[PDB]
Structure 1
Amino acid sequence: EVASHRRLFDFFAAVRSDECNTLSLVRFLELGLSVACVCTKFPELAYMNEGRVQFEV
């Protein structure tokens, strides 16, 4: 889903891994509103060809 999702993303590069002063540091992240405007989500799109949604009014 989410934690199961990137757990193979770290592993994919992991098996591809075999294949005078400080203050050199800045930090960063961006979430929270990163789900609000999105205003829905389906995760896990597999090998897919066509997505249909039909409307009945």
Structure 2
Amino acid sequence: EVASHRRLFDFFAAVRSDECNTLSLVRFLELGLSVACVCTKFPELAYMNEGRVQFEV
């Protein structure tokens, strides 16, 4: 889903891994509103060809 999702993303590069002063540091992240405007989500799109949604009014 989410935690199961990137757990193979870290592993994919992991098996591809075999294949005078400080203050050199800045930090960063961005979430929270990163789900609000999105205003829905389906995760896990597999090998897919066509997505249909039909409307009945």
State if a TM-score over 0.5 links the two structures: yes
- State the Cα RMSD in Å: 0.0
TM-score by structure 2 length? 1.00
Q: Percent same amino acid among aligned pairs?
A: 100
> Any gaps of 5 or more consecutive residues in structure 2?
none
TM-score by structure 1 length? 1.00
Cα distance in 2 for residues equivalent to 1:46 and 1:25: 38
Shift of 1:31: 0.0
Structure 1, residues 2-41: CA drift from partner, whole Å, max 9, x if none? 0000000000000000000000000000000000000000
Deviation beyond 3 Å, 4+ runs, structure 1: none
- Give the length in aligned residue pairs: 57
